[PDB]
Each structure stands twice: as C-alpha cells, then as structure tokens.
Design a protein around this ligand. Structure first.
Ligand SMILES: Nc1ncnc2c1ncn2[C@@H]1O[C@H](COP(=O)(O)OP(=O)(O)NP(=O)(O)O)[C@@H](O)[C@H]1O
Ligand SMILES: Nc1ncnc2c1ncn2[C@@H]1O[C@H](COP(=O)(O)OP(=O)(O)NP(=O)(O)O)[C@@H](O)[C@H]1O
Ligand SMILES: [Cl-]
Ligand SMILES: [Cl-]
Ligand SMILES: [Mg+2]
Ligand SMILES: [Mg+2]
Ligand SMILES: [Mg+2]
Ligand SMILES: [Mg+2]
Ligand SMILES: [Mg+2]
Lengths: 358, 359
C-alpha cells in the first residue's frame, strides 16, 4: 500500500465519451508541492457520465463500476467533469451532482472533496500541467515554448505560454507559480469543436467519407480530404472564429514544441496510419487520410479491417484535425505534433494533483 | 371513438423514435375502395424520454426501454412500425445494427406485437411523412389543391422541409417523391438537414454571449449579453457558410412558392411560451426574433428564471428565436413577415400519420 507512506488522491476525468479514475501517490517538496507523482491505479469506463439518466439506480451502477474494485480507497476524490456536462444547462447538471453527492454520502470507501463541472479554460490549464509534468519541464526555466492541444470528443483545448496581457480576457489567461517558477499561460477551449460534436455537422458530406460509404441521407461518399478539410474550416472559422482568436496570439508567442493528447492519439496509432517516434505532421496526416481512407472504396476497405469500428470516420477526422490545427490555429502543415502513446492513458488529471484551485 | 376501437376497425402502431424521445401512437382507421386508410384516429399515445439512440444497446436496456414504451398499451396484437430518425442517423451503420439486432430479438421473443419494420428512415422519408401527416390533418389530400402547402419539422437533431415541386431531372431523385393518394398524383421536394436540429445546433453556440439572457452563466465562465440580431448572424453562418441551406433551398422555393407554411416539432413549444404574444397559432419570423430579443435576450437571467419556473428550456429561448429566424429567413429565404402556422403543442403532432397513409 503506497498510500501508507505517501500522499494519495483520486482524480476522475469525467469526459464526454467516458470517465477515467486515476489514483496518484506523491510526496511533497519544501513548499508542500507534489513531486514523485506515480499513478498507482486507473480504471476507464464508458459511456460519458452526462449521457446516463440522472437517477439513483443508474448513478449507483455507474459509480460502482468506476470505483468499487479500486485496490485503494479511504482517500480524497476530485470528480471533475468536462465538455459532456458543459453541453447541459446548470439546472440539468445539478440533478447529476445531487445524485452523485448522495451516492458518496451513503458510503465510507471514498472521501469526496469536490464534484463539479470545470471550465474548458481550467481543463486547458490542467492539460498543460499534466503534459509538462510528464516532460519534466516544470522544475526549471525552459528556453523552449511548449504548447498543448487536447483533442476531445466534445471540446478541444489549446494552451501555450503567453505573458500576462491587459487586452486579453482574464478568463483566457492563467498565472501560476510552481516549483518556484512563475508561468503565464494563454488558455482556450472550443465547445462543440470536439470530434463527436463536430462530426454531427458533416455526416452528409460526401467528401468526408470513403467512396460509396452510405451517407445517412442516402447519397454516397466520394472522399476527398482537401475538400472535406475546406468544409470543416468553415465551422472552425466562419462560425467559431478560431483563426481570428488564436493565430495573432501564436504569431506573437511562438510555440517551439507541440504536444497533443486526447483522441487524436488513437487515430495516429491506428492500423490505418503510419507515424514514427509518436509524432505526426498535419501534411502527412491529411495525405494519409486522403489516400488510405477517402479515396478507397468503402465496402472493400471496411471488409479489409473488419474489427475496426472507428475506421469509417478517419477521412473526416484526418481532414478535421488539419482544419483545426492548420486553418484554425495557424500551425505550419510541416510542424511536428508530438502525440502521447494511448497506452499511457495520459489525460489532464495530473494537473489536478499539482493545482487544487479552479 | 368506440370502446375497444380495434375490435371494430383496423389498427396499427407507429413509433417515432426521435432524437429526444420515442412516441408510440396506435391508430384506428377504415379503408376506402382501394384499401386506403380513411377516418384515421389516434386511440393511444405514449411518449418516453430519452431517445432510443442514447441508450446502451444490450438486451437488458433494450428490454427495459421497449417495456416502458409498449407494455401498458391497451392493445398489443397489431402491426408495429418502429422508425428512428436523426438520433440514430448520427451513428454509423455498424453501431445502429446493435440496436436493431437487440430490438428484433425482443420482438421475436414475445407473441403479441407484430413487428413489420424496425429501421432508421432517411430524413427525406421523414419529410414525406411530415407532409402527409400535416396535410391529412388539414384535410387537403382528398382533392386537388388551390394553394401550395409547405411543412417544416423543427426537430432536436435534424430539420425537415417539404413542399410541392414538379419533377426536376436536374435535382437528386432522393430529394423528390411522387405519390398517388386518394386518386391524386402529388410531387414533392423533400430535404432534411442533419445537425441543424435544435439540440445539435445549440452545441456550437453555448459560449456565445449574444445567444443568452444578460448574466446567464455560460459554460466558459463568461456572462450572457443577449442580442438576437447578433446571435442570428452567428447561427446563419452554420446554416449557410457550413451547410449551404440557402443555396440548396432558396432557388427551388423562389420557383415553387408555398402559399401556406406549417411547422411541427419543437417550434410549437417555443411559440406557446407565455413570454411570447402570438394569435391564431401562427407567428412570423420578424415577430419571433423581436420578441425573443426584447423579452429574453435583453432581460436579466436570474429575474427571468424566477419568473417562469415552468419553462424548462427558458435558458435557450434567446438562442432558439435567433436560430429559427436564421434557418427560415436566411436559410430557406422565407420572408420575415410571412405567416408560419404552428400546430398547438397539446396536439403532440408528429409525422406518424404519414406512415398509416404511405405503407
Ligand atoms: N480505439 C480507438 N480508435 C480510434 N479512435 C478512438 C479510439 N478510442 C477512442 N477514440 C476516439 O477518441 C474520442 C474520445 O477522445 P477523448 O479525448 O477521450 O474525449 P473525452 O475526454 O471523452 N471528451 P472531452 O470531454 O471533450 O475531453 C472518441 O470519440 C473516439 O472517436
Ligand atoms: N414542453 C416543452 N417546452 C419547451 N420546449 C420543448 C418542450 N418539449 C420539447 N421542447 C423542445 O423540443 C425539442 C424536441 O423536439 P422534437 O420535435 O420532439 O425533436 P425530436 O423528434 O425528438 N428529434 P428529431 O429526431 O431530430 O426529429 C426538445 O429538445 C426541446 O428543446
Ligand atoms: Cl439524413
Ligand atoms: Cl467552456
Ligand atoms: Mg453498492
Ligand atoms: Mg477529455
Ligand atoms: Mg449528443
Ligand atoms: Mg501500424
Ligand atoms: Mg422528430
């Protein structure tokens, strides 16, 4: 039991597609800041918490499946929900939390500290802290700028260093002091631009699916990734104004190394795609989606990869990630984007260990 | 209505499995000289939430869902059509198939309901049923019509539009349907826009302060600062820059004017709110947008919320007023002063009578 000799907390990432419990052990330095953070347990369940019916029976079944088999309990729990809950008004979210609070009050294995929906900006801060914790770039002043993108199912987050600025909304800027270093970040989350929510606007776009893929409207796919990418960009920019918000800031505050977490890791590591060194470029992701999915005959390709239930969307996703990173954020198509191997189950929850405010 | 109407008339069950919920209807009818239904009467209705597509597809959850939908119906030994719409269209076929395999098995394990079909219908079929159902209720199907009747179905995940249009070999055969009913030949244009339903579309504007009442708490922690003209222009970008609604629809309506517009779906719920002032179950887009702007967008959220404790969807009314105008006016090109009839929401009117007529 590592929790006998080290501080332990549980952090739950309640994401739009699933919930992930992590138990972390850690020590603290001279300032009571965590160090030597180690994940001692994880459990992932689907579907997303916001997708279940908020009643006592269903909430119990879900929380039991997430938590009951954990080898360690009697520890503090932070239950932080993200874009899945943000899609609901507070009045509806409150029913989930009233039931979840009751569930925790009716048991003794877990000590609930907080259960709340965090903002996308809070999520983006955690994303940057988690990745930079893993990269060991927090202990000393970096002479490289590290930017983080979290490519979620309902929202996407972008976060990078930016000096404090009186012109930009306070909500989009965070100052923290960690390991005696003062860090100032720009944060932004785009609700609705996660892969699931985005996709619901393009299901009848023939350019976004393999040839003869059966579109729900009865037309056939006729894949073409550059054309699909142009359609997605209209959502990124004409609707959400991603380019106008993000590009001038990155021009002034270049990022030297980009890391991406979230579902893009699963796409990049899938059997259809081929990348070395756990990194990609937008140019190569768009070309590979174009040639290996968009330009293929759907029934033939589906039958080649029988077990693969994400495949059908890869023409669209490859196009969308390019639209978002290149046409939205302004990233060069040849710029390396590091992605974290999915096997690491790396989400933003280490950021909560490091940073207990919101 | 007779006691035990199904002992005296033909009966069928039609289930609208919509994105927000499923509605069972049982209709009695007689048939005329060609075995075509007449005197269609709803004898039972049950609506359950949430949508079929939102459940986890396994035998336990499907059993519980269909039991909740069907078990207390007053008659079970009748044909059943289970037609899902945009909620299921959001899913790939492989994912949909898990639902239908479980549903089929459930029907085969019981011996009363007579399952005829359980499938996802296209938005084009849905729009055909929308037009048949509304025109059946208006009694415009028997005889050739003076005026063109158009129907809009303002759903949670998709919206449908349908109106008379002579055959055009230059338009996809999927967007056209010829029918012969009660001895008359009718040609319709049909179209559905997936993702432009109220729920799906709203997920692109939740952090737009122009689309919410003043001081409404947006998810990103900023405050509402409502302005319906502003929010309408945001929504029009999704309609047109993204979906090309105007390019698709406007050239056809210009050339095939609709004399009378009817809307069904969730729009009747908005228009019925005590915040609005409409007469004769009809609205105009201009009046909808101005009233949303003044009564919701530019009002204080906490005030509004305490004042209308019976409007569950109140928080969305600024956005929905703006959205309806963007879709109908900037998308379809309908004049903002053109009357739009809405069917009183107590009528629970959906497209399902269309299936009684069309099968
Ligand atoms: N095995 C897989 N292969 C390919 N793609 C996958 C796989 N598993 C998950 N994904 C994709 O990743 C998406 C989920 O990404 P993820 O970053 O976990 O989102 P989330 O945290 O649940 N949503 P959000 O609340 O917006 O952060 C899913 O919708 C899938 O599309
Ligand atoms: N009582 C009500 N008051 C106000 N708004 C309501 C009310 N009931 C439903 N609505 C709105 O109408 C929506 C449901 O519209 P509806 O026509 O039932 O869509 P659907 O058929 O479930 N989806 P689709 O598959 O796209 O047709 C809900 O999401 C609400 O936002
Ligand atoms: Cl469709
Ligand atoms: Cl947010
Ligand atoms: Mg228990
Ligand atoms: Mg996430
Ligand atoms: Mg959804
Ligand atoms: Mg490989
Ligand atoms: Mg509907």
């Amino acid at each position: 039991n590592p929790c006998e000799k080290h501080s332990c907390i549980a952090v739950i990432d309640a994401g739009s597609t699933g919930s992930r419990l992590h138990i972390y052990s850690y020590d603290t330095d001279d300032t009571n800041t965590p160090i030597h953070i180690e994940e001692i347990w994880n459990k992932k369940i689907k579907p997303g918490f916001a997708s279940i019916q908020p009643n006592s029976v269903t909430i119990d079944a879900y929380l039991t499946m997430l938590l009951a088999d954990a080898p360690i309990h009697n520890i503090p729990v932070y239950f932080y929900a993200t874009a899945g809950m943000r899609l609901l008004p507070q009045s509806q979210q409150k029913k989930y939390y009233d039931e979840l609070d009751y569930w925790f009050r009716q048991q003794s294995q877990w000590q609930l500290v907080e259960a709340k929906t965090i903002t996308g900006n809070d999520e983006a801060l955690f994303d940057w802290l988690a990745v930079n914790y893993k990269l060991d770039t927090l202990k000393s002043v970096q002479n490289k700028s590290v930017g983080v993108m979290d490519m979620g199912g309902a929202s996407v987050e972008i976060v990078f260093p930016m000096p404090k600025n009186a012109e930009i909304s306070k909500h989009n800027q965070v100052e923290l002091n960690i390991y005696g270093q003062n860090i100032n970040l720009y944060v932004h989350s785009f609700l609705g631009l996660g892969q699931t929510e985005m996709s619901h606007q393009f299901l009848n776009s023939p350019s976004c699916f393999a040839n003869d893929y059966p579109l729900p409207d009865g037309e056939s796919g006729q894949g073409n990734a550059p054309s699909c990418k142009e359609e997605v960009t209209s959502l990124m920019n004409s609707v959400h104004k991603v380019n106008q918000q993000i590009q001038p800031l990155l021009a002034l505050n270049p990022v030297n190394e980009w890391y991406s977490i979230g579902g893009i890791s699963n796409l990049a590591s899938s059997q259809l795609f081929h990348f070395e060194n756990s990194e990609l470029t937008n140019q190569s992701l768009l070309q590979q989606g174009d040639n290996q999915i968009c330009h293929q005959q759907w029934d033939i390709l589906n039958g080649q990869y029988p077990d693969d239930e994400y495949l059908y969307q890869y023409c669209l996703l490859s196009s969308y990630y390019y639209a978002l990173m290149v046409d939205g954020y302004g990233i060069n198509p040849n710029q390396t984007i590091h992605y974290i191997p999915p096997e690491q189950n790396l989400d933003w929850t280490i950021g909560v260990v490091l940073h207990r405010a919101l």
